Amino acid sequence: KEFKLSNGNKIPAVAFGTGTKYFKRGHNDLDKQLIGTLELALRSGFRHIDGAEIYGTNKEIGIALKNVGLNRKDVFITDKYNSGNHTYDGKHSKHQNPYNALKADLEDLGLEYVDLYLIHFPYISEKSHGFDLVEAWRYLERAKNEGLARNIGVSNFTIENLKSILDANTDSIPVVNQIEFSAYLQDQTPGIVEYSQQQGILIEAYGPLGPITQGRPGPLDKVLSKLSEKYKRNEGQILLRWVLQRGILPITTTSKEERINDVLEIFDFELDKEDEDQITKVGKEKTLRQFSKEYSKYD
Ligand SMILES: NC(=O)C1=CN([C@@H]2O[C@H](COP(=O)(O)OP(=O)(O)OC[C@H]3O[C@@H](n4cnc5c(N)ncnc54)[C@H](OP(=O)(O)O)[C@@H]3O)[C@@H](O)[C@H]2O)C=CC1
User: What residues bind NADPH, as annotated?
Assistant: First the structure.
């Protein structure tokens, strides 16, 4: 039920997300349904919630955590610095740097620390932020040494984006690179999963159900239909299990109770190597990219 990070710290192997579906669009009101669903998820056995400054859902996470009252050490919380989009237009975190942003978010969360803190997107430059990408990492390093983030990482980084940090003289290296990853998207940017895995950086996969949520009709429908019958598992479940068997941590979300339990049952079964391999092969027949579409030139 968990992965082990580079530094030996454990991370629960499925996460409940609070972006996409729940991402606030021109309001800051509490999302009461979300808080409800977070409670249900935690009480059902989720122990890893994926959040971000830009989502506007960090308050909800903190309320749900307080209402459930799990031991703090048993829960794994991710937050992310709103670094901005690929235009470097300056539309990003309202705080002066990632360290001050994480501090403000911790107040929204009602927590002493997050378990993982990420640079959300790799578009940081002095002209747009007052600091460059490696100094943003340095802020993350201050947060880590201070105790404000147990682990630090990145998101939506290419290999060259990773090299900016690894090649600098730094205290530590990212332990996670959270990217879009699904059977229809096996490499968000070229060689990223393979390069990261070889360096010991854990890949977390968001948008893992793309094939099913936005990818129908496509070449996986026939394959998933057959394995659903054979495993007595639904297609969402097969896809997520398959992500796990690639050594990747899937991040999903839902507003439906029955799906909370579907997701948590991905650890009660195994796909035969041959069936895993057919998903990976047939996956490659179609390309589906839902996020970070500046990367679409690679498709
Ligand atoms: N770092 C980054 O740039 C990004 C990070 N993320 C993180 O990852 C999280 C998850 O991403 P998302 O893309 O939503 O994840 P998924 O790929 O897992 O899609 C989840 C969606 O699938 C639906 N769903 C679940 N099961 C089925 C089913 N079998 N058939 C059809 N639909 C189904 C859910 O709808 P329903 O509610 O109706 O069940 C939900 O809306 C985000 O909330 C966010 O926290 C996401 C995007 C970018």
Answer: 18-21, 50, 155, 178, 209, 254-256, 259
